[PDB]
Design a protein around this nucleic acid. Sequence first.
RNA 1: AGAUUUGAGUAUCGUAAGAGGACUCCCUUAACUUAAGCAUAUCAAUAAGGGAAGGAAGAAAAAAUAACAAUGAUUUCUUAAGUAAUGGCGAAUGAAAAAGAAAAAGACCAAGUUGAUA
RNA 2: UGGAAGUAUAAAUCGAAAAGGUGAUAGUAUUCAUCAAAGUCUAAAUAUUACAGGAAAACUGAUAGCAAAGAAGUACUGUGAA
RNA 3: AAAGAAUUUAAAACAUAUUAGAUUUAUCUGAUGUGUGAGAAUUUCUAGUUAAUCCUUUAAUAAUAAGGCUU
Lengths: 49, 204, 226, 148, 89
Amino acid sequence: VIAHDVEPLEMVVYLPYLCKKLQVPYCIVKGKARLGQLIHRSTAAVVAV
Amino acid sequence: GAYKYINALNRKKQSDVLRFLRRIRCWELRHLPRIHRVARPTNPERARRLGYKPKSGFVIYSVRIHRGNRKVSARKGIVHRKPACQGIHKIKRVKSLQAIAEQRVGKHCGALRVLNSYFIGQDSTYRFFEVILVDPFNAAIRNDPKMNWICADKQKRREARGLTSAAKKSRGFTGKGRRYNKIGAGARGNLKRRNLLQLKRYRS
Amino acid sequence: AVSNIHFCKDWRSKVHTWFKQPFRKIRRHQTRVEKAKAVFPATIKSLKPSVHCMNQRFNYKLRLGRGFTLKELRAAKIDKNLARTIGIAVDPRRKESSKECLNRNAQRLTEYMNRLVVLPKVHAATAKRLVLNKKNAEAKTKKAAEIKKFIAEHNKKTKQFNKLPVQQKEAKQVLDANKVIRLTAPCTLETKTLTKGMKAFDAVAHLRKAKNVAKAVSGIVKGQKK
Amino acid sequence: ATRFRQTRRRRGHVSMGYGRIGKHRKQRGGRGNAGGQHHRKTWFTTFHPDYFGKHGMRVFHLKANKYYCPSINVDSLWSLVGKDVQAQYKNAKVGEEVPVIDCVKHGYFKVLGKGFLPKQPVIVRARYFSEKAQQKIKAVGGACELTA
Amino acid sequence: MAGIAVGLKRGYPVHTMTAKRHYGVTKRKHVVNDVIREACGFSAYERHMMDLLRRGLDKKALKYAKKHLGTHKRGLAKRDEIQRALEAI
RNA sequence: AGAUUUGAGUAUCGUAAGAGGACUCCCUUAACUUAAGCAUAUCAAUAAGGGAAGGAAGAAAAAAUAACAAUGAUUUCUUAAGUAAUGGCGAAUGAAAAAGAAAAAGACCAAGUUGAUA
RNA sequence: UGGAAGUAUAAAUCGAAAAGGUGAUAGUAUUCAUCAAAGUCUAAAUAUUACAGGAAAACUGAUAGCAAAGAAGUACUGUGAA
RNA sequence: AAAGAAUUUAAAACAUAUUAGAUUUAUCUGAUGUGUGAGAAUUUCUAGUUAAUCCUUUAAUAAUAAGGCUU
């Protein structure tokens, strides 16, 4: 799961293209603060399952 | 490792993705003040390489500098010189724009130490760098055995003496050997040593 | 004679006088003495290899180098981690030039290791190494029996590392170890038996054949492509 | 010794030995080797007739160690070991033991042939040999050895 | 006794002894290169070089590459690297 | 409303400034002078102008030499050497490896890996 | 710059890598040798005519030696730098 | 056709085979193995044939280029 509002965008831009090559399912949600609440932090760039 | 992809991605600066993002960043820095603090580095891969650590006492400053060349500062372009020195245009600064920008940031923030700097972008007029600065009087920096070298007295205004990587390259310290015979341990110190006329106490 | 004198520049600011020379001796000698009093092993000017000089103008002479290669320590059965602690210079940057260099500098380390007397890390007689030597002293004697025997009869796996010579002795303080282990033995007058083949060996033709062979490689390559 | 100069003997003479018609002025034709082709051409023609010009090929970086080759003639070979050893092996021939002269050990690389050798066999060890050097060593009953 | 100081077989007789270590890359660089190339694409001169290669002007693709890279050997690698992209497509 | 990002005001504890600059590291395109004129060159990293340092500073651990019977961080001294080379090839300018000594010391980040992850 | 078909730096444009740099005559190829750039630190050997404290001298001995052997950068001059 | 002993012990580059792992990409990574590279022929000379042949660009060659020497 990749946040859409990560700044700078250069840190997660390759993740869709890397996951596309390895056939790893990936989704992009809205809010790096929403992800951070899952892991009890202010923000969270990416979360995997 | 995430940062082995960012480094590979950052080498494709002519790609559409990086060109568009640099366009937005270069536009934004054209309106903000010339020297100002940014919250986090815009190139964390390159910032981490040059010594930035996300800890207290490490700050990032953005500086905008007018790239290109400038005329020789003589009134109305009039110099009372021989035709060998009668050039006004086409003369280039010895120090790189990165070294010049590092000194402007260091002068602005006299109480911090310039660690290193890198390149953000450029346009037809400006070039934007980012300067990694360290507070030498932070308790974290003082107590770090791997970093408290920056708390030495001799490191006061590093960039103005020529100790940073950007300012050391403009001194000629980019390699070793027969190509760098005149920049052995300092270009001006080397010349003084060779020109010394040694007069021993007992001489013929 | 046509004069070439470079005094057109301000030599008066380039003049360096040596009035401090008689006081450099006193400074350096006194500091050299002070280091010896502090830790006398330190001023020993740790042992160094016997490496040839560069170029054919000097290649027959030997001079002290910097540091033994990691292969020379292995050959002499010394750990590279312990080597720096007992006054041995170590230079990982040195590529082993030849087998002769490897053997010659392996003798230098072995000879130095025999003259070495390492004091115990703790001066008390209750030190573990001194105690350990007592505990296995019985095994040393039986070990020293079989080694002394198959040596005495003869005249592929060996120890990786030897033992550090550790004991308690009087402190005979020697200021350097390079002047105890000479680089080159004194050269006597060499002398040989004259044989019929020696009289017949034509040195000049060998020199010119060796030279002319090197100058005909171009003729070989040029005629090949035709 | 400033008391032995000519200045002390010319006190009282007005011009100090420099002439009245032509004074001792600052210059006498330029500073240094000035006018090498205009008014001092007769000096350079007379005393350095090849000063101006070019000759030979440039060596951008000359490796002066590759031209190092000390030389010794045949007559001077025995001086390396001295007359004491030379007389000791004066009555030797082929079959028995003969002294070896190590020119390289003494710093001599090439052996040239000049002068006359003593009429005794000898073994000469060196890096290079002249044609006449080997002839004179062989004509006396000796052998030549290469090195390096 | 001693060798000879002239020629190919030159030098004092000794047993000279190093390894020409290859500074290479692992098998994961192929994945990294493929990932970045998809996310980035090709530059203006790489795009212009692909067009020339398609028409069969291999020499013009090398002359163009040498112009934009400055080295004959670097131009050859880019020409081969680009033509490998065409074969995959 | 709440979760973040970014930017400010205020309070607390600190930090820079100025003096000195003999020695140290640098920026800048002086001219007088020499070339028997003079315009490249020389004077010359020289003068003046400007910045930054400490009791020393600078440099320092090979993308280094060499072509050897090979060496091995930096610095300083001897020699190479008024030599290779540069130059209206004129006036003039001008190194470095080898070799001999003083002293000797090597360690880190980044990237990679470990993730009930701190 | 001694570095000569470019030794070093900078600017405009261009811009790499399944690595590569150097072997100082430009170019291509094949071998060989030797290193592994584009981040940081690091004592010792070295310099010194600021200034402070000392010791010496084939130095000067009141027109000499620092400008200054006394309330010397003082008296005095200039709008001022001096 | 004629004279010729050649110097003497601590070894790594890998050209590789053969296996133990991993990989799909211009695919790599260890270890086992032999030779290589090993040392207790070479030169001269006469008649052929082939080739090269004014010197240099300093690790070795090549075709271009450049520099030398004489006029």
